[PDB]
mmCIF file of C-alpha atoms in Angstrom:
data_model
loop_
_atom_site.group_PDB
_atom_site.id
_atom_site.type_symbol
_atom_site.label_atom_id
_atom_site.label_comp_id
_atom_site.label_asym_id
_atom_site.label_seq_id
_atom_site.Cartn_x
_atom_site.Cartn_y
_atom_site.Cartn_z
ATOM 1 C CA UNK A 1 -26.916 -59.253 -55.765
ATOM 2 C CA UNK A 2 -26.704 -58.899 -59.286
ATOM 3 C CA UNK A 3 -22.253 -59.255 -59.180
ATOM 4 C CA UNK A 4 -21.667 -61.178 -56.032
ATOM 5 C CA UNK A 5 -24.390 -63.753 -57.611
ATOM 6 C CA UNK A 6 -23.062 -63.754 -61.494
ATOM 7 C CA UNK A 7 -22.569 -67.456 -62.721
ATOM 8 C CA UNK A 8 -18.786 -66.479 -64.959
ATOM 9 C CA UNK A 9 -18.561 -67.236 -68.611
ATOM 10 C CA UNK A 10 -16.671 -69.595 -69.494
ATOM 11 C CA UNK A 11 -13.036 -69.150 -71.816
ATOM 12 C CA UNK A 12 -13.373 -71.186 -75.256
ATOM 13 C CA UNK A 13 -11.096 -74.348 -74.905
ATOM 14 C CA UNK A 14 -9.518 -75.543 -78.505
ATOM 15 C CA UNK A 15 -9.203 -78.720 -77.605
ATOM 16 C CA UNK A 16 -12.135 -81.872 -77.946
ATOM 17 C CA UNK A 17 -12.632 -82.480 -74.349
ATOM 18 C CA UNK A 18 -11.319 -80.872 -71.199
ATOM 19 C CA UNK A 19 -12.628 -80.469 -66.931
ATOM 20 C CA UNK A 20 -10.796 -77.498 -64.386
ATOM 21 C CA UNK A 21 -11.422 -79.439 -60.664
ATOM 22 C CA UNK A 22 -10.165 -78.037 -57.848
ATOM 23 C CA UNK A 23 -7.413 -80.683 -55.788
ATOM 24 C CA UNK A 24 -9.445 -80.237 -52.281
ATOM 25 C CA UNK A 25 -12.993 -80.105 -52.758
ATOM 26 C CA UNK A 26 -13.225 -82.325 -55.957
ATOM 27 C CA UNK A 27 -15.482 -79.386 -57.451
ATOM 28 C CA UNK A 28 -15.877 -79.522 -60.967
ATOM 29 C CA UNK A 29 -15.354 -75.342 -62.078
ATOM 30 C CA UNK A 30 -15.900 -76.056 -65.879
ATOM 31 C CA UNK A 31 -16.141 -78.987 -68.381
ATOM 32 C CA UNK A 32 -16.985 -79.959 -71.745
ATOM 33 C CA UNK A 33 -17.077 -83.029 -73.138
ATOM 34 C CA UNK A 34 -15.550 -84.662 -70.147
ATOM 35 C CA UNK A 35 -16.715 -88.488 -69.861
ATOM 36 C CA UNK A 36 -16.054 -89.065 -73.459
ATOM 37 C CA UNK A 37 -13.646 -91.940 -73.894
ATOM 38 C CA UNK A 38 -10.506 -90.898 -75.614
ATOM 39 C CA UNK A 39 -7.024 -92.544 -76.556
ATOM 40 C CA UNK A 40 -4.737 -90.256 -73.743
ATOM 41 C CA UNK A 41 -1.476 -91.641 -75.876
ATOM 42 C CA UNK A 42 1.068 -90.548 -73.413
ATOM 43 C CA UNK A 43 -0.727 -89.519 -70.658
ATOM 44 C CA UNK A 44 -1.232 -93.239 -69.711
ATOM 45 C CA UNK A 45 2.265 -92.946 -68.053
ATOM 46 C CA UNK A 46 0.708 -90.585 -65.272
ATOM 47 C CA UNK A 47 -1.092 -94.220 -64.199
ATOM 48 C CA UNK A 48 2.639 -96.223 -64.848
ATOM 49 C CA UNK A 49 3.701 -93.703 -62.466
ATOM 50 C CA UNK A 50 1.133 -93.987 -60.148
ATOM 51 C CA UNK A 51 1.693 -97.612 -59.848
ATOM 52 C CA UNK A 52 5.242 -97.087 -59.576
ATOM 53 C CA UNK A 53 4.721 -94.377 -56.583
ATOM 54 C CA UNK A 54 2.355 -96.713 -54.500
ATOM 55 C CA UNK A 55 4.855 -99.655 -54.522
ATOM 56 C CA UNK A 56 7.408 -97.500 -53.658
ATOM 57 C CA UNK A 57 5.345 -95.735 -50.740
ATOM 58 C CA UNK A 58 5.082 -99.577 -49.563
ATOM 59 C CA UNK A 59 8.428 -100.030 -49.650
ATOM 60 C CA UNK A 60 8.889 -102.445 -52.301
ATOM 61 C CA UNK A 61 11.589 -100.687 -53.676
ATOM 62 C CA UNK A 62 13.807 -97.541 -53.293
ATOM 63 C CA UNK A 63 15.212 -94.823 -55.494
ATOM 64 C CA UNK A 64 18.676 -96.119 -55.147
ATOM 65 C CA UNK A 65 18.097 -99.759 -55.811
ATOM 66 C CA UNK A 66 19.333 -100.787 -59.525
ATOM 67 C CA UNK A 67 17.434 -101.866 -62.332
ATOM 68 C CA UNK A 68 18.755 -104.497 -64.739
ATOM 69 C CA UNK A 69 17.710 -103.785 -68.492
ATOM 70 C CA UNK A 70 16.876 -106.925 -70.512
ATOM 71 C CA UNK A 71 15.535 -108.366 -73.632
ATOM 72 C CA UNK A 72 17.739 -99.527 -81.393
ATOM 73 C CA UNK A 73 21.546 -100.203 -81.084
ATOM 74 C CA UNK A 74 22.015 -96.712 -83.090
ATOM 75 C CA UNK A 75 20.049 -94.164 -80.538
ATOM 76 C CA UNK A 76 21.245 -93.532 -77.123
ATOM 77 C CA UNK A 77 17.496 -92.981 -76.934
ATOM 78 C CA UNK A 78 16.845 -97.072 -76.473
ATOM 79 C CA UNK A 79 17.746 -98.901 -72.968
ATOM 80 C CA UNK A 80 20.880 -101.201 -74.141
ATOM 81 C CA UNK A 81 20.151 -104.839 -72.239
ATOM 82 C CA UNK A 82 22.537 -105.278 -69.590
ATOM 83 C CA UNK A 83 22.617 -101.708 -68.688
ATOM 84 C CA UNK A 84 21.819 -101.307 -65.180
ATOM 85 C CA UNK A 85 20.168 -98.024 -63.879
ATOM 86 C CA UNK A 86 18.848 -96.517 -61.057
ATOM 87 C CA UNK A 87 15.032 -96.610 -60.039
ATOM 88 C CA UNK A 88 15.640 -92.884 -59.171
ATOM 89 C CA UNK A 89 17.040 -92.297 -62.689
ATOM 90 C CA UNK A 90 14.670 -94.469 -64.598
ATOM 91 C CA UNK A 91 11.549 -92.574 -62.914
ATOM 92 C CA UNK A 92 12.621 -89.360 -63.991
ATOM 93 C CA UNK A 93 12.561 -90.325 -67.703
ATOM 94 C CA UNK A 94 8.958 -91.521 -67.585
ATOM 95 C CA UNK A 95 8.040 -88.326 -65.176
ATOM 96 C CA UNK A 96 9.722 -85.793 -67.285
ATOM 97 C CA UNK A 97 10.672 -87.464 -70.585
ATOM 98 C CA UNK A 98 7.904 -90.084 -71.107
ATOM 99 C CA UNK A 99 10.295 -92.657 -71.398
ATOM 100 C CA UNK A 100 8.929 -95.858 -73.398
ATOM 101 C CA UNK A 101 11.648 -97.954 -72.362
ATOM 102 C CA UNK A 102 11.599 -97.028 -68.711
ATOM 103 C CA UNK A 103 7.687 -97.960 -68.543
ATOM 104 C CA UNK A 104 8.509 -101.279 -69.396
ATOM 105 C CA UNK A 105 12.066 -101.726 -67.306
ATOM 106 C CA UNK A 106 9.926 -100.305 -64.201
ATOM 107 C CA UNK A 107 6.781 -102.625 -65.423
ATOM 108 C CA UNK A 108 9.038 -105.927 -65.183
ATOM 109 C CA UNK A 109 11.093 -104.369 -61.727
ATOM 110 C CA UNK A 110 7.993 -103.938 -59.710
ATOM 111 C CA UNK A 111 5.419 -106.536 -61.322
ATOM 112 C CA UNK A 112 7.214 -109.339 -62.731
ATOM 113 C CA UNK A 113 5.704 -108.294 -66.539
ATOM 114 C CA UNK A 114 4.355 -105.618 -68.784
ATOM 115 C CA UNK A 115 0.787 -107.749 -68.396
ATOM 116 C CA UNK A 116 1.065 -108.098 -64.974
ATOM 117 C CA UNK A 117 1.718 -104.469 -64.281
ATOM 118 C CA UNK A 118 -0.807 -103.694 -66.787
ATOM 119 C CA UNK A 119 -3.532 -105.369 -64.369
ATOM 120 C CA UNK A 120 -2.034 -103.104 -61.493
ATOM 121 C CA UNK A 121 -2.987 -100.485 -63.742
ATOM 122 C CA UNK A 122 -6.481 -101.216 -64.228
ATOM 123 C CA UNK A 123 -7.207 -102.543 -60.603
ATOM 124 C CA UNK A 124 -6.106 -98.809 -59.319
ATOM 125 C CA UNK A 125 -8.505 -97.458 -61.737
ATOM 126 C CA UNK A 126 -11.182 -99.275 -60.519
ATOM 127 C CA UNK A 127 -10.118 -98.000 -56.867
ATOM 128 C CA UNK A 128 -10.053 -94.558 -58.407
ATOM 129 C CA UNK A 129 -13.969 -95.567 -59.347
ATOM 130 C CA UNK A 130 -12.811 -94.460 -63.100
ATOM 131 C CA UNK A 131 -15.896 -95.355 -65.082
ATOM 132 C CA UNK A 132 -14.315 -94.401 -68.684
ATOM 133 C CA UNK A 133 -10.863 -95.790 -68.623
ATOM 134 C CA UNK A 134 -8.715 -98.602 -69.531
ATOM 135 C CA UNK A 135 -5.377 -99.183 -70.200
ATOM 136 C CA UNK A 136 -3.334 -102.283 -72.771
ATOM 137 C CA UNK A 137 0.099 -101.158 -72.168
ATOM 138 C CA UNK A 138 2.140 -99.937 -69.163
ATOM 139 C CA UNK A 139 3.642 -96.840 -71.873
ATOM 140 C CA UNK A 140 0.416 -96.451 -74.161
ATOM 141 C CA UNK A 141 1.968 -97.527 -77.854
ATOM 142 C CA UNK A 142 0.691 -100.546 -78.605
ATOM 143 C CA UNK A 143 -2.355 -100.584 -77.258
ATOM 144 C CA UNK A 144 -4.962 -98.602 -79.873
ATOM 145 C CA UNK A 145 -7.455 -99.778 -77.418
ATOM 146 C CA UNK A 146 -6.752 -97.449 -74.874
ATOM 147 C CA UNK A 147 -8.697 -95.018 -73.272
ATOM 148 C CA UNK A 148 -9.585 -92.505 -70.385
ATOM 149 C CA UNK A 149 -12.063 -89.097 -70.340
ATOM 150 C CA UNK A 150 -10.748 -85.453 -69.464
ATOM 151 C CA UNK A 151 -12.197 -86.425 -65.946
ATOM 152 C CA UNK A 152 -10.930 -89.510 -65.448
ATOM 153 C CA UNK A 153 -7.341 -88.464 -66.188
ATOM 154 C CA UNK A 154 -8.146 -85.153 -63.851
ATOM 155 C CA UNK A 155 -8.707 -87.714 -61.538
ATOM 156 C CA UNK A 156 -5.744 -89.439 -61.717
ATOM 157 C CA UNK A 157 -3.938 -86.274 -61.624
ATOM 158 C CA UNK A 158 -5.772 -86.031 -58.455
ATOM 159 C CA UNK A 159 -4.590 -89.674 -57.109
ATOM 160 C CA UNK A 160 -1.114 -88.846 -57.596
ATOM 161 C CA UNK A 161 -0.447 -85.499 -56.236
ATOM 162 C CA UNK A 162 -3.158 -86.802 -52.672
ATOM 163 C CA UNK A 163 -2.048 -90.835 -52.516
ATOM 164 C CA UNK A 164 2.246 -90.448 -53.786
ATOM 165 C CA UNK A 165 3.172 -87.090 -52.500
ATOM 166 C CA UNK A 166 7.171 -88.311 -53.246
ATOM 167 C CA UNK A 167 6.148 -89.482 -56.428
ATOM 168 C CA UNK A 168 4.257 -86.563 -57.893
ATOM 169 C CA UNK A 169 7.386 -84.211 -56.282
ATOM 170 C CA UNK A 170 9.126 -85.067 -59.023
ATOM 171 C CA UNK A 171 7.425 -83.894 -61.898
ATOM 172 C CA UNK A 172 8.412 -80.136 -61.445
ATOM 173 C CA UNK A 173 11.929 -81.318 -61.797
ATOM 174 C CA UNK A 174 12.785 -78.768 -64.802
ATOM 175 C CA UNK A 175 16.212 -81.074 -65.790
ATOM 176 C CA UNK A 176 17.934 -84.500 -64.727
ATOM 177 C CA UNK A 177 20.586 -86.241 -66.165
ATOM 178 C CA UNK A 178 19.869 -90.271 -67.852
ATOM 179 C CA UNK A 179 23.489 -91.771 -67.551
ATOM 180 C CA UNK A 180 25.645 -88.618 -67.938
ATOM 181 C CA UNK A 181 23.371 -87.156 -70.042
ATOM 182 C CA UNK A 182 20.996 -84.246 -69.592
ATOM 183 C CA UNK A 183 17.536 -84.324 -70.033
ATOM 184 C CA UNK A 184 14.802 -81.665 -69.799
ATOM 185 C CA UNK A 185 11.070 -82.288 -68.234
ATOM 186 C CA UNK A 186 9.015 -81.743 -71.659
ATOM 187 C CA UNK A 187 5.830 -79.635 -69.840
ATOM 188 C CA UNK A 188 6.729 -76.585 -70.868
ATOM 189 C CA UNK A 189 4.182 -75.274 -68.729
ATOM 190 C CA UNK A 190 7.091 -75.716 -65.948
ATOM 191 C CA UNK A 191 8.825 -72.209 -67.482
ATOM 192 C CA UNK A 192 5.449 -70.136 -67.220
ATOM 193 C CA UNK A 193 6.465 -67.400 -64.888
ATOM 194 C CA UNK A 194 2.540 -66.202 -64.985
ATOM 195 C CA UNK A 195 0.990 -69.783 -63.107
ATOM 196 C CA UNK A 196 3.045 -71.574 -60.402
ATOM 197 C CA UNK A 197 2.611 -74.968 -62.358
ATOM 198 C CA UNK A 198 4.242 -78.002 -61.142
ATOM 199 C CA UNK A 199 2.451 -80.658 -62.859
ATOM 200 C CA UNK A 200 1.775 -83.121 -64.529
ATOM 201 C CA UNK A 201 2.127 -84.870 -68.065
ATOM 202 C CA UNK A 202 1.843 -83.568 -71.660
ATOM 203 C CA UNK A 203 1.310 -85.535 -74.692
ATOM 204 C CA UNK A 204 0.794 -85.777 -78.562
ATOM 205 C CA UNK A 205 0.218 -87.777 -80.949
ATOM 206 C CA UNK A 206 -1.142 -87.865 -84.281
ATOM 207 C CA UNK A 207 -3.997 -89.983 -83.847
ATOM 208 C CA UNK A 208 -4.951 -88.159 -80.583
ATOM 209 C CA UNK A 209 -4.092 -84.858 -80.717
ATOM 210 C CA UNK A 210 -2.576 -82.160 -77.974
ATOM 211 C CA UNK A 211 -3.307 -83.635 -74.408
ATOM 212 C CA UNK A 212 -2.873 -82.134 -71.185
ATOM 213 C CA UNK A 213 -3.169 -82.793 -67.362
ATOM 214 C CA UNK A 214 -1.918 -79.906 -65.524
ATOM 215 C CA UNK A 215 -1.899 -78.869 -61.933
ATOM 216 C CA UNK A 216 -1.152 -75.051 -60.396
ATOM 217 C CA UNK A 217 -1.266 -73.345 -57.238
ATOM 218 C CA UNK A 218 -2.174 -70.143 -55.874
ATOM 219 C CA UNK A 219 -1.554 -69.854 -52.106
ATOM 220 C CA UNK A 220 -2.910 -72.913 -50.485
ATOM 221 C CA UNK A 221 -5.015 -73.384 -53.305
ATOM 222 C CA UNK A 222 -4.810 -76.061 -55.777
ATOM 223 C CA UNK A 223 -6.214 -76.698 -59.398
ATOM 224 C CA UNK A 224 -6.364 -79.216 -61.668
ATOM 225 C CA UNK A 225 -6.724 -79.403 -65.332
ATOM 226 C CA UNK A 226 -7.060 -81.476 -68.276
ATOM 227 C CA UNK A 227 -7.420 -80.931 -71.456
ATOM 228 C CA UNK A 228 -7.493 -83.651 -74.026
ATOM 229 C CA UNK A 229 -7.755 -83.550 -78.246
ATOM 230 C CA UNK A 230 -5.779 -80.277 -78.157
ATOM 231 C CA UNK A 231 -6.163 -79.106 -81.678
ATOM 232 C CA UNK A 232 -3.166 -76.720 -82.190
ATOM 233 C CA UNK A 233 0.634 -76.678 -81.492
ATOM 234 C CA UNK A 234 0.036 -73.231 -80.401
ATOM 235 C CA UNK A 235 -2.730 -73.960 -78.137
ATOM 236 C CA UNK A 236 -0.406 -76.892 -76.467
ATOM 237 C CA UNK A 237 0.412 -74.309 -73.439
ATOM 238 C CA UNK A 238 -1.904 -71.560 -73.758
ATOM 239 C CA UNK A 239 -4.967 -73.588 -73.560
ATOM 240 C CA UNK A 240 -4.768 -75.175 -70.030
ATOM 241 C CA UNK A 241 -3.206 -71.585 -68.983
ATOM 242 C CA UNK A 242 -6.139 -69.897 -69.873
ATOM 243 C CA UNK A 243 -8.332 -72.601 -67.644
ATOM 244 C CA UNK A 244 -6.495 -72.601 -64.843
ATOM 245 C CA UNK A 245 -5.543 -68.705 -64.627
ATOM 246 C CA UNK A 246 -10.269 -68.104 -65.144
ATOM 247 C CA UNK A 247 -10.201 -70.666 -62.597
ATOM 248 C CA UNK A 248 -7.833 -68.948 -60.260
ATOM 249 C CA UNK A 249 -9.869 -65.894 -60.908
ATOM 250 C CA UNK A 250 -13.355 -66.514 -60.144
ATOM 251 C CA UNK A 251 -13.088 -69.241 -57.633
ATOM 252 C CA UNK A 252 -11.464 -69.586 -54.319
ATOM 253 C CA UNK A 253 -11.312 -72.906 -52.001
ATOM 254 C CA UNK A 254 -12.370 -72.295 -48.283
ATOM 255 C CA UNK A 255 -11.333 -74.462 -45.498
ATOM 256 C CA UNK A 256 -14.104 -73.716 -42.985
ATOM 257 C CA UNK A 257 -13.877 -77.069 -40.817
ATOM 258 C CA UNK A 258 -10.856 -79.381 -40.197
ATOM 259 C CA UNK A 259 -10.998 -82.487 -38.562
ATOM 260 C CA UNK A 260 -10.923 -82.458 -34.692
ATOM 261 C CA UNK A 261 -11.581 -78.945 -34.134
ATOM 262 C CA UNK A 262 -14.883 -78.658 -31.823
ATOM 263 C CA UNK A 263 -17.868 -77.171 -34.221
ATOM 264 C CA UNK A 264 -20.184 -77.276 -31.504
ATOM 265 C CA UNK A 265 -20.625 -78.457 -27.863
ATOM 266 C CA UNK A 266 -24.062 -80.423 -27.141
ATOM 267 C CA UNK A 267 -25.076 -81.940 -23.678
ATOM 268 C CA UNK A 268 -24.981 -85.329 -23.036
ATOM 269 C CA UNK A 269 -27.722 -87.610 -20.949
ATOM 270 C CA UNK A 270 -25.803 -90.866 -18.572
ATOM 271 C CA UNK A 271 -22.902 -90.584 -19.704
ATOM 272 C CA UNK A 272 -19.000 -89.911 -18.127
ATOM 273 C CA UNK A 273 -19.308 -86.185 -19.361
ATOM 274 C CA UNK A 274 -22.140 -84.111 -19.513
ATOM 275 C CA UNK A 275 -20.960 -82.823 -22.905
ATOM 276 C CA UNK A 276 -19.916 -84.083 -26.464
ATOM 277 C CA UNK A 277 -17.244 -82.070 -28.317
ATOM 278 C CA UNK A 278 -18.906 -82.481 -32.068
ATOM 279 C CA UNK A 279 -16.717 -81.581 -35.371
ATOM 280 C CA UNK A 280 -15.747 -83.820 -38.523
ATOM 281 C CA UNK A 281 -13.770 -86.817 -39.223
ATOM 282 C CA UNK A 282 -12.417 -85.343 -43.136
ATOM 283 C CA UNK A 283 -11.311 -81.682 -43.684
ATOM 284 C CA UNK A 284 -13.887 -79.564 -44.698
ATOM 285 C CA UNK A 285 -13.033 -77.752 -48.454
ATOM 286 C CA UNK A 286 -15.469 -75.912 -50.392
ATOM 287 C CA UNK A 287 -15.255 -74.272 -53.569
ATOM 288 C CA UNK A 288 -16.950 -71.156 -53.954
ATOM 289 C CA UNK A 289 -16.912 -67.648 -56.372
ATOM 290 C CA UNK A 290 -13.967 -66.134 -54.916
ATOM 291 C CA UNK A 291 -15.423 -63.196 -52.889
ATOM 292 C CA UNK A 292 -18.411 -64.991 -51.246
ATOM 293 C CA UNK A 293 -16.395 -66.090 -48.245
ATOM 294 C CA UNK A 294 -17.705 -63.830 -45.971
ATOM 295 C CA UNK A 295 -21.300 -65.171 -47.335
ATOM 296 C CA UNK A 296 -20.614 -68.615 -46.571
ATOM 297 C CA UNK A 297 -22.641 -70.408 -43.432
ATOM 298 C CA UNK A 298 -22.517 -72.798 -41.284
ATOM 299 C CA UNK A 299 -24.847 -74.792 -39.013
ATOM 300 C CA UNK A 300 -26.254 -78.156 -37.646
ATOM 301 C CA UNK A 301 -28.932 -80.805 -37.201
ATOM 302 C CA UNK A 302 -29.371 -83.537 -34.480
ATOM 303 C CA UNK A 303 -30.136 -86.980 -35.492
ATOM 304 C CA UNK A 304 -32.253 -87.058 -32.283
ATOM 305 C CA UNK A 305 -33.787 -84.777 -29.861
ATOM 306 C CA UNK A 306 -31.209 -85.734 -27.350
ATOM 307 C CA UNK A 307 -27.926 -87.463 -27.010
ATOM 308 C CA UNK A 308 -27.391 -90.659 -24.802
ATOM 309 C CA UNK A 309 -23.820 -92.493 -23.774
ATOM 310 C CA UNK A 310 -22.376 -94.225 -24.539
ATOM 311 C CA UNK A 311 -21.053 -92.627 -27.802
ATOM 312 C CA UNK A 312 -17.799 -94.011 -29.573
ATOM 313 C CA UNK A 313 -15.416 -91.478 -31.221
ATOM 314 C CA UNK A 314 -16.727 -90.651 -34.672
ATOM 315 C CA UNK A 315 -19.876 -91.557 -34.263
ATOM 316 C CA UNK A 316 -21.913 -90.140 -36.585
ATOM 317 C CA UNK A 317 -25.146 -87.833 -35.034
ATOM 318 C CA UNK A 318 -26.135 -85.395 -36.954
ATOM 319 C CA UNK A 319 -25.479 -83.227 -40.097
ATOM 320 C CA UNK A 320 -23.712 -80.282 -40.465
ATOM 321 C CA UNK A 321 -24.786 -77.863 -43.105
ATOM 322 C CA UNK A 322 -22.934 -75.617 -45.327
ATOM 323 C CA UNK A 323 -24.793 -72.783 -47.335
ATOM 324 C CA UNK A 324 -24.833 -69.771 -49.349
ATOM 325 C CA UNK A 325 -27.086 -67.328 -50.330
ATOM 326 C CA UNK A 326 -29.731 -70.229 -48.647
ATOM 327 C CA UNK A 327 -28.474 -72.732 -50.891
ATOM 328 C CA UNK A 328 -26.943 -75.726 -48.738
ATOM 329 C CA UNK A 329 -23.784 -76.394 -51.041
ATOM 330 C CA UNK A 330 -22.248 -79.018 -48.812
ATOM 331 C CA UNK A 331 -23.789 -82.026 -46.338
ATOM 332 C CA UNK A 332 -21.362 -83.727 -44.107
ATOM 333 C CA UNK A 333 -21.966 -85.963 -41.075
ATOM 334 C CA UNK A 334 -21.794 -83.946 -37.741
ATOM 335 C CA UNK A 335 -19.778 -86.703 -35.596
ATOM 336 C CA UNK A 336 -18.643 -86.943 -31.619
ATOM 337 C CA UNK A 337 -14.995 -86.197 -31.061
ATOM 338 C CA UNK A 338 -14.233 -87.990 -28.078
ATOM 339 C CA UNK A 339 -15.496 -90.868 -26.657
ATOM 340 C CA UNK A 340 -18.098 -90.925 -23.789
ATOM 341 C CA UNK A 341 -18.761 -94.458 -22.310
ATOM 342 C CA UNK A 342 -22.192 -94.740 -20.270
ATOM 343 C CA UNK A 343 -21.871 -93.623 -17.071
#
């Protein structure tokens, strides 16, 4: 009892907000702090990118399609007007460098304006159901206004990596070169040899400190982190890698039902078959104390005493239950699998 039933302690976070959510279930492992509306300075650009990711999924635009620059002279570090650049290229510096210029080149390419794409923004966060976030500016500079939560930009971690698989591939990219010159992604996190990290966006700034959103796997398992109001340059790294590493080690993410496989067989009155193949219509993922797998149970109730044709495909009739230690830890509609008109 007393060690496959321990609740783990928690590692202290430096930072002034922070949440460790696993990718599949959406279970929250730890938190503190995390609904309280911050400034995310730089971490804005994970929603830019977002943006950017769903029009390209739709096919509004492709990696190799050019971008025209348009309305500093002394830094190869400022977009010269005129300069014309590849979507592919101009990506890469907002997914690895941050890139303030290529916000706002991108902003104009896929939305007309900075305001425009700036509405974009917001309407995907209230699709996210983000409660404590909104955003000014498609790069996060001039825009004091600002702000998201440690959960909220979790989330958003979330939205990328599930919604714009080809976008979010591109943020382990260690190195890419910006017109002949080379460039290096700036999450360090990237080089840790300890955590297979391959996500997502770091950021400072005075006014809001070390910020975070960071994503690792282990296996098929997947974590996500953020950690915002970092207080020290030497806690940049090391905080998030402590998170995710505890979370890694007392927590593991079961798959116990996926979609279409047959839970259970139940007989079925006037219908074309005298039985209904019953499962889910969403993958099953639960996050439990890693070692309690073998614990973990499964089972079902009936809507009704019987079940009648005709019955569509994914019709919902029951629940199915999943416990541990007699704690139900997950409810999920039990529905039929295949279709049985009356007959």
């Amino acid at each position: 009892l007393n060690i496959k039933t321990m609740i783990p302690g928690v590692p202290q976070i430096d930072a002034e907000s922070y949440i460790l959510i696993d990718y599949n279930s959406g279970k929250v492992l730890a938190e503190q702090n995390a609904d309280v509306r911050r400034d995310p300075a730089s971490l804005t650009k994970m929603m830019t990118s977002y943006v950017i990711g769903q029009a390209m999924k739709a096919g509004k635009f492709k990696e190799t399609d050019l971008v025209t620059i348009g309305n500093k002279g002394s830094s190869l570090m400022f977009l010269k007007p005129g300069m014309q650049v590849p979507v592919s290229q101009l990506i890469r510096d907002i997914n690895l460098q941050s890139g303030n210029d290529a916000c706002v080149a991108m902003a104009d390419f896929a939305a007309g304006s900075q305001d425009a794409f700036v509405g974009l923004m917001n309407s995907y966060v209230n699709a996210l159901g983000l409660k404590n976030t909104h955003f000014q500016t498609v790069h996060g500079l001039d825009a004091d206004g600002q702000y998201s939560s440690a959960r909220d930009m979790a989330l958003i971690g979330q939205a990328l990596i599930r919604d714009v698989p080809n976008e979010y591939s591109i943020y382990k990219e260690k190195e890419f070169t910006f017109n002949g010159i080379r460039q290096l992604n700036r999450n360090g996190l990237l080089w840790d040899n300890s955590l297979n990290v391959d996500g997502i966006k770091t950021g400072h700034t005075d006014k809001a400190g070390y910020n975070l959103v960071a994503s690792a796997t282990e296996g098929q398992m997947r974590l996500i982190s953020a950690v915002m109001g970092g207080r020290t340059f030497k806690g940049r790294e090391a905080e998030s890698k402590k998170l995710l590493t505890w979370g890694f080690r007392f927590f593991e993410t079961v798959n116990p039902l996926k979609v279409g496989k047959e839970f259970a067989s139940e007989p079925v009155w006037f219908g074309d078959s005298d039985r209904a193949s019953l499962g889910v219509d969403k993958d099953v993922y639960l996050t439990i104390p890693r070692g309690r797998m073998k614990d973990l149970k499964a089972s079902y109730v009936l809507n009704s005493s019987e079940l009648h044709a005709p019955l569509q495909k994914n019709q919902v009739v029951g629940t199915i239950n999943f416990q541990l230690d007699g704690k139900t830890i997950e409810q999920r509609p039990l529905v039929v699998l295949q279709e049985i008109p009356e007959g």
